[PDB]
Design a protein around this ligand. Structure first.
Ligand SMILES: Cc1cc2nc3c(=O)[nH]c(=O)nc-3n(C[C@H](O)[C@H](O)[C@H](O)COP(=O)(O)OP(=O)(O)OC[C@H]3O[C@@H](n4cnc5c(N)ncnc54)[C@H](O)[C@@H]3O)c2cc1C
Ligand SMILES: Cc1cc2nc3c(=O)[nH]c(=O)nc-3n(C[C@H](O)[C@H](O)[C@H](O)COP(=O)(O)OP(=O)(O)OC[C@H]3O[C@@H](n4cnc5c(N)ncnc54)[C@H](O)[C@@H]3O)c2cc1C
Ligand SMILES: C[C@@H]1CN1C1=CC(=O)c2c(c(CO)c(-c3ccccc3)n2C)C1=O
Ligand SMILES: C[C@@H]1CN1C1=CC(=O)c2c(c(CO)c(-c3ccccc3)n2C)C1=O
Lengths: 273, 273
């Protein structure tokens, strides 16, 4: 089960609803016996920009700096910037990771985007040989608790912004699941700036109620990596048998693997698929 | 037509292909009579974090800081941080804006994400009353020129990463088109790290060739805001009449407006739709 939790918050104001939601999760989990650690990016004045400075020492090839290779090497040899390592330790010690943030330009705040870029270093957070379900964080679970200015209807299939499931895909599949994370249902609190005070109090309590049993939840469905030929040769394309079999399925496997057919309803919002 | 172009680069190395793509684009554009301005985020050591320091004036509500409102107010009264103002001036002058960046965790680099967050302030880059096609930059055109580590097949409908069209959606529709921009087909350069020297040279020539007539291209398709009842009362939902003409249609309208049906092939990569 789950015993330790990491709450990554990306909001500058201690007076925001996001901070309240972070406080609610901390209280709720602790009161349930969990150990809670925080990564309040702004309060920590976190540096989100990847650079050659992330490697405390000489680079393998300063004449042509390539961050991927250099950062992985620094990782292996233990030359990663201290601030990066400290976060990597929080990740390794955590069973549950909660990402609390306000949706910004249909994605995560830049400070958090940068946190992934500098913290999710190769070898540590992933390998091309163990992508997705086989990733390093397979024993861990992640959840996005998001707040927005736009109303839920704006994000429905007929809303002007379009399906929220598409917006979540690059984050939940491309970032979290790629590293092995079992991704749980996102906590979506729409139009928080247009919500009555009593309703907000209920949102907080609802979030705490869910956290009581968060670890017994069934995670989102992503196509298993066993359906693909995971080698540079086949170009990591679906196995031909799976393709043929899939040809007789009404729905695609997920948002990203829609295969040109109907995307399973709320594939990135609701579990059981 | 268009004589003014802005190239926003998000890469720290002068030795990268990304920098090469930036030079090639500028060289080719100037050759066709364009005026070319640049925003090399790293070279500028651009601040990517939105904070109350983006406002130089006295806040309207200092004890309860709210970025959306305060920033919009600062734009309206001329109290925005001068570095943000400098970027906004480049945007207003530009006819064509090119975003050159390496794909990082299925999105734009944090430094570029922060650029959108601090520079695309309300009123300046958008207004709820005139979202999408009615936005401020509707007389402008934007293009994403991306380079990736992974091969094209990994991003095909059956590649492990999933459809690249889904990854592109939140940036091209949510950020670019939301502000009125006509978005042109993205220049996609896959597995740049695994491309032979002679091929890389051809990729650059091909990019210069495309830019020779970039302004006359058909842009990508996004559902017009006219298909929606644009008011907090109708939940910014698609017009009932429009919803009825589609129930018979096979394909959805776009990636975000797939409507539970099939997404039009390469909706976010190829024009004509
Ligand atoms: C750069 C940028 C980009 C954005 N892009 C998007 C986008 O793409 N899509 C979109 O939909 N939105 C977008 N937004 C809007 C953003 O998502 C919302 O402004 C944000 O989620 C609002 O929540 P908040 O917690 O940050 O803060 P706040 O606006 O402060 O709101 C929290 C509310 O709850 C109250 N409150 C605070 N603490 C408590 C407590 N303990 N108990 C009860 N009530 C409390 C506050 O007084 C306030 O009214 C963007 C905003 C910015 C700045
Ligand atoms: C934090 C992070 C996250 C990432 N996330 C992803 C992801 O989600 N998906 C993904 O697919 N990839 C990802 N990548 C990989 C990234 O997309 C590639 O490393 C990048 O696109 C490579 O291009 P480059 O221009 O930066 O540099 P380089 O790797 O240097 O490659 C350019 C190549 O062209 C050569 N070259 C330079 N100038 C010229 C010239 N003028 N003419 C001809 N050849 C030239 C160089 O020597 C080099 O071999 C990530 C990388 C990082 C650091
Ligand atoms: C996608 C681009 C980035 N932006 C936004 C889009 C919205 O649709 C929106 C916002 C806000 C916040 O400014 C509210 C909002 C805020 C308060 C109360 C009600 C709605 N709404 C509906 C945005 O910021
Ligand atoms: C980990 C984040 C999610 N993304 C990546 C996914 C890939 O599939 C990938 C990367 C790289 C770059 O590290 C190369 C690559 C690099 C050099 C040569 C060949 C492939 N490939 C195939 C990534 O960075």
């Amino acid at each position: 089960a789950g015993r330790r939790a990491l709450i990554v918050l990306a909001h500058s104001e201690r007076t925001s609803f996001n901070y309240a939601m972070k406080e609610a999760a901390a209280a709720a989990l602790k009161k349930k016996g969990w150990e809670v650690v925080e990564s309040d990016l702004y309060a920590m004045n976190f540096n989100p920009i990847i650079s050659r400075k992330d490697i405390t020492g000489k680079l393998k090839d300063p004449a042509n700096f390539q961050y991927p290779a250099e950062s992985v090497l620094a990782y292996k040899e233990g030359h990663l910037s201290p601030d990066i390592v400290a976060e990597q330790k929080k990740l390794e010690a955590a069973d549950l990771v909660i990402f609390q943030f306000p949706l910004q330009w249909f994605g995560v705040p830049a400070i958090l985007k940068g946190w992934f870029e500098r913290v999710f270093i190769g070898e540590f957070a992933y390998t091309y040989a163990a992508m997705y379900d086989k990733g390093p964080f397979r024993s861990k679970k992640a959840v996005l608790s998001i707040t927005t200015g736009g109303s839920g209807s704006m994000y429905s299939l007929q809303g002007i912004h379009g399906d929220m499931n598409v917006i979540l895909w690059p984050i939940q599949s491309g970032i979290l699941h790629f590293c092995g994370f079992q991704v749980l249902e996102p906590q979506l609190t729409y139009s928080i700036g247009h919500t009555p005070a009593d309703a907000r109090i209920q949102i907080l309590e609802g979030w705490k109620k869910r956290l009581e049993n968060i670890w017994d939840e069934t995670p989102l469905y992503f196509a298993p990596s066993s359906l693909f030929d995971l080698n540079f040769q086949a170009g990591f394309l679906m196995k031909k048998e799976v393709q043929d079999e899939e040809k007789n399925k009404k729905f695609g496997l997920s948002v990203g693997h829609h295969l040109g057919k109907s995307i399973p309803t709320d594939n990135q919002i609701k579990a059981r698929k």
